[PDB]
Amino acid sequence: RKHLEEVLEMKQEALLAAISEKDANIALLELSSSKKKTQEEVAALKREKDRLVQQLKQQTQNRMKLMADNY
């Protein structure tokens, strides 16, 4: 159980950094979004951010399901 916990923690840490960096990149482009091409990249990064946030939610549900087993 301690071993499974170390594995899940490392995978979540990768995901939290990816969410934060994806969001940081959105904020950067939004500063100078004075162009049709820029908002199109912003829209795509926002799609990618939602996808990552959704993965985190599902990883969280899996994490609690696997913690509810016997070791």
Binding site: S20, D23, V53
Partner: protein, 168 residues
């Protein structure tokens, strides 16, 4: 034109004290009367402009429901700022902020900015903790302090401005 930095803020507190409502008021200038408990953890963000700096505030909104409790230390470790919220009509929620703050320091030590928030000031007839007791508790734990109402908006913008002005 200025440099942009990101900073992560984790919102902590007993269930139903108003963590999400503070965020909804800051993000959407709205208030939801119907309680919708946070299931697990949620992510929201907003850019703030400051003299010679721009900050991207990234918010981990955590659930107060006890079943999610063991997931929260991960988000405290991920965050440089902790917003610990209680309900001014609810003495137990205030007492528990000592535990929340102690958990923050277990994960971050001194490498963290902590804001203690007494929310729901609009429920003045049901107040169980004075503003003085909150101010003195915060001084004793060496944290920042503010009272807010997510319902009326009182001090909600000031909460995030004061946190943003405290960042490196």
């Amino acid at each position: 034109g200025n440099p942009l930095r990101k900073f992560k803020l984790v919102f902590l507190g007993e269930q139903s004290v108003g963590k999400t409502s503070l965020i909804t008021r800051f993000m959407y200038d709205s208030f939801d009367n119907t309680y919708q408990a946070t299931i697990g953890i949620d992510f929201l963000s907003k850019t703030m402009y400051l003299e010679d700096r721009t900050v991207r505030l990234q918010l981990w909104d955590t659930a107060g429901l006890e079943r999610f409790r063991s997931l929260i230390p991960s988000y405290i470790r991920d965050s440089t700022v902790a917003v610990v919220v209680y309900d001014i009509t609810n003495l137990n929620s205030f007492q528990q902020t000592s535990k929340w703050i102690d958990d923050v320091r277990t994960e971050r030590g001194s490498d963290v900015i902590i804001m203690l928030v007494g929310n729901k000031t609009d429920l003045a007839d049901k107040r169980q903790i004075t503003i003085e007791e909150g101010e003195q508790r915060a001084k004793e734990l060496s944290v920042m302090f503010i009272e807010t109402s997510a319902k009326t908006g009182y001090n909600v913008k000031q909460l995030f401005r004061r946190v943003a002005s405290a960042l490196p």
